Design a protein around this ligand. Structure first.
Ligand code: FAD
Ligand code: FAD
Ligand code: C15
Ligand code: C15
Ligand code: AI0
Ligand code: AI0
Lengths: 495, 500
């Protein structure tokens, strides 16, 4: 058996960040990676037609200081996602160009209803602790409802309900009826709220890495050399003896003092445990699916939308559109012109039966309609990735909680099992579900082990992160009117 | 590699029924079983204090003709669960003895709401095809709701909502807010409807096997000899070559023409697949958890409840009650007096924290109050089993579907993946979740392979079962008033119109 201090299961950003921290402290680490590559839910493809493209996780923004610091140390640089020109909201077959992060509403009733919906999401989130959403005062009430039920209660207009629905689908790649209200409200709150999570400028979609996000995992693998073992899916963890034994599918045996599980919670099911896991974890890892998404990038000779004062951001309502949201994927030099679109949730399941060429045609015809340009019909290249088909991801972007699961099982996610500690973006308390959360969780799980070894004190397990000098955060502001305008039922009670 | 025609993964009733049919058709089968025993979600404990006791699946009834035929062919007998004396409905801290399958209701408004609740469950059920629930006309609308949301709309009284909530918790060991309304309505309809599923006499809980249900899997193991491999958890299935390769955790390798997966759907996650599963199954097996239950059996010197004219059946409402449902578990000879109780859904999670001794104490104190009997505080013995802790079950009784899953993923549940066919009770069309469903699914998957090998025509894959001559099924009937009495909103509509 191959002996070390710590076995990290998974070479995504979380496992790699944990292995780097432990290695830098002088421990002997092995990373066991199921795939022939590192990066997990990040994947940068290179070819002459795209140069590079992020087919998985890509965007970083202000307040994501851990991923910005790790990336910067590895020698990576960011560029700004194009948002110079106007965004488009496509509603009932027509494009309404706009500026600022929220699509505007002109009907006064619809205005009140939209304003109330976003405000209520943040008002609710203020009562949900980031590190313990199950301790929200109304935790059971909110956990025993879907986001569909909450939206049915909150939204007096079909206008607000359809945009709120698009918001849920885009944020967590799942249907409003699939997900706990408590979990979704926590999810928004722990990215800093609605403005911060939906914003390009001054939010989660502000920036991409020059050369792709896959370089974070690749360059940590560079540092660690042959400590990273590719095509070693873990099948068996034995904790009955003095050292932990980890076995891979290719029959190799690893022996360590501790283990970091840096895999999506439900992919814990692929591992046979001795002794069996405690009951709550045993059932938890069956209750925590990942969402459904195809990430699709259509390439054009030029960023032609910019000539019409469109930035390439499209918010597209309605069942018929295959893609509900797009960003300009053009490289900083203005070349490799491209539109990134997501095929989300039930549409990812529905449209996966088509050919690649059939999806390209549907996307080009949608983009031609929304951008009002025949140039959208003349793509020069297409890349896509269906994350639903990934045995060692389970989906993307992240794990969602169905109704009732977070209050019953949420406590178990980070709870150590003997000498196994739990990393993965799912265990983060800030930008859980993102590359930032992957870094937070890996580093925390690594410091839990340093503390178990007596190397650091308890108060050093969770560590704050200084603000990026390169990507500083501006405050989220609200207007007097946004804060005090009544809801629709509010305006009724006042009549 | 050990060579055969068919590897069966799982030595539950489903896997063993498959293996037996294939073996009887003259094929070479191997059963790879993870545990040191067959039976899976059935488990008969034997010791001198209890003689035998079912800690997993136990009850069989009318219309479950496949498990009754299989058990009869293996030399097993049934006996009737005690329903001679009165049942008890315990609500707001008081016990109301009754007869017949449903706890009665005297308040006329409450009576209409209760009658409308059960009636509407079966009415919606008749819209849902047993073999394709996602083809129901309102499949999408029903699948996008929880059972909690459906009870909130249907029940105009708290009385009906509370009883309906207990019915869901007991039937599928899950909370109303956890389960799809479509899936639950399907689950009840594919058992023959509300009356058949809830009933002891004339329903699912009518009988048990003399000597325990574990004998079904054990006796098929006896027929199969060394073809059954215990402590062979399957870790890897390879379909990239001419024959399928099946690898176990002890590094043994099995080579076969075909595989039957006879394990709970989510436990497919414990197997590494080459090539990868198709997308829809890849994601479905992360979306289908099992329910939560502790089965608890408290033993007494005598079945003292019978002397107060209680059969031992208790339907117990309220958060404080650790157990919502009990049945007499006394042996047919009248000895090893016992009460069987289920701790359901969130209470299986909450009370798992306690010791065995603390759970025994809470159950005795509950039983003493409900039966109005201090004898209930004098147990002689206790057995229990928390199915939440089983690595190779994932829960009990069965797989439930959360909102949105049955319409998006339900169709791939028994869709073959190249040379892998799917058994297990979850893939049944009649009494899915039960031992009956395990037999139907196992025999159906076996016959799918017999068809693939050209040994039978397609019309022999699905086969009807002759009615047991030993456990005949009384039909389910309604009275004129049950069929036609209005709902509470129906009555308010009548009132509205008269008054106009
Ligand atoms: C898929 C995706 C994700 C995504 C997104 C868009 C798509 C299409 N957009 C994002 C974005 O713009 N910005 C951002 O910050 N995040 C975005 N996401 C999510 C993001 O990619 C993830 O949050 C992050 O990558 C998660 O990292 P983490 O390290 O937590 O997890 P992982 O990448 O899934 O890595 C797990 C690794 O474990 C290996 N594995 C799995 N099972 C085993 C076993 N049994 N043995 C050994 N290794 C195992 C995986 O193969 C993987 O490498
Ligand atoms: C647990 C339970 C179940 C139950 C019930 C009460 C409890 C507490 N009450 C029932 C009742 O009164 N009447 C009835 O008909 N059913 C009742 N249920 C449900 C019933 O027990 C189940 O429907 C039935 O036994 C399921 O049979 P099936 O054959 O489909 O599935 P299984 O019993 O889970 O068997 C699966 C076997 O597979 C092995 N396994 C799991 N993973 C692997 C791997 N990777 N490799 C090899 N083998 C594996 C399991 O160990 C098991 O033996
Ligand atoms: C009208 N809708 C918005 C459908 C429900 C009102 C919400 S509530 O009636 O205020 O709960
Ligand atoms: C007057 C309001 C009574 C609401 C009664 N409940 C049963 C709570 C809701 C009925 C829902 S539905 O109205 O039948 O859709
Ligand atoms: O919410 N919005 C953007 C969003 C959110 C979460 C993401 C996660 C990963 C990758 C992304 O590109 C994400 N984009 C836009 C929006 C604004 C107003 C109404 C509806 C929708
Ligand atoms: O539904 N009832 C019993 C039932 C149903 C399903 C089962 C499945 C497995 C094992 C069992 O013991 C089961 N018992 C009684 C009842 C009647 C009226 C209201 C609420 C409850």
């Amino acid at each position: 058996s191959n002996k070390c201090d710590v076995v990290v299961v998974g070479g995504g950003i979380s496992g790699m960040a944990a292995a780097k921290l432990l290695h830098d402290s002088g421990l002997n680490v092995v990373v066991l990676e199921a795939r022939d590559r590192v990066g997990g839910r990040t994947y940068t493809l290179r070819n002459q037609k795209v140069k590079y493209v992020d087919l998985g996780g890509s965007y970083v923004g202000p307040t994501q200081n851990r991923i910005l610091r790790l990336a910067k140390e590895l020698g990576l640089e960011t560029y700004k996602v194009n948002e110079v020109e106007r965004l488009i909201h496509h509603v009932k077959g027509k494009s309404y160009p706009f500026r600022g992060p929220f699509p505007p509403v002109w009907n006064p009733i619809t205005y009140l209803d939209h304003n109330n919906f976003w405000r209520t999401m943040d008002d609710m989130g203020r009562e949900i602790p980031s590190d313990a959403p199950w301790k929200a005062p109304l935790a059971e009430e909110w956990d025993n409802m879907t986001m569909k039920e909450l939206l049915d209660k909150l939204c007096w207009t079909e206008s607000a309900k359809q945009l709120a629905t698009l918001f849920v689908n885009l944020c967590v790649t799942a249907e409003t009826h699939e997900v706990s209200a408590l979990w979704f409200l926590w999810y928004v709150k722990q990215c800093g709220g609605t403005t911060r999570i939906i914003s390009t400028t001054n939010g989660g979609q502000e920036r991409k890495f020059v050369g792709g996000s896959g370089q974070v995992s690749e360059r940590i693998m560079d540092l660690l050399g042959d400590r990273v073992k590719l095509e070693r899916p873990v099948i068996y963890i034995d904790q009955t003896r003095e050292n932990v034994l980890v076995e891979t599918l290719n029959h190799e045996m690893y022996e360590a003092k501790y283990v970091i599980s840096a895999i999506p919670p439900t992919l814990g099911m692929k591992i046979h445990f001795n002794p069996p896991l405690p009951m709550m974890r045993n059932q938890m890892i069956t209750r925590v699916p990942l969402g459904s998404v195809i990430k699709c990038i259509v390439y054009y000779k030029e960023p032609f939308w910019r000539k019409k004062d469109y930035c390439g951001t499209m918010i597209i309502d309605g069942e018929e559109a295959p893609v509900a949201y797009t960003l300009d994927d053009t490289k900083p030099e203005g070349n490799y012109a491209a539109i990134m679109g997501f095929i989300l949730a039930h549409k990812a399941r529905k449209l996966a039966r088509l050919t690649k060429e059939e999806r390209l045609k549907k996307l080009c015809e949608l983009y031609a309609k929304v951008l009002g340009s025949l140039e959208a019909l003349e793509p020069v290249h297409y890349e896509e990735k269906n994350w639903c088909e990934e045995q060692y991801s389970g989906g993307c972007y992240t794990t969602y909680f169905p109704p009732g699961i977070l209050t019953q099982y949420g406590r178990v996610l980070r709870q150590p099992v003997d000498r196994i500690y739990f990393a993965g973006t799912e265990t983060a308390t800030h930008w859980s579900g993102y590359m930032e959360g992957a870094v937070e969780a890996g580093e925390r799980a690594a410091r839990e082990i340093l503390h178990a070894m007596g190397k650091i004190p308890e108060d050093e397990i969770w560590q704050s992160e200084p603000e990026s000098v390169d990507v500083p955060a501006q405050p989220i502001t609200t207007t007097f009117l946004e804060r005090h305008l009544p809801s629709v039922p509010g305006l009724l009670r006042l009549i």
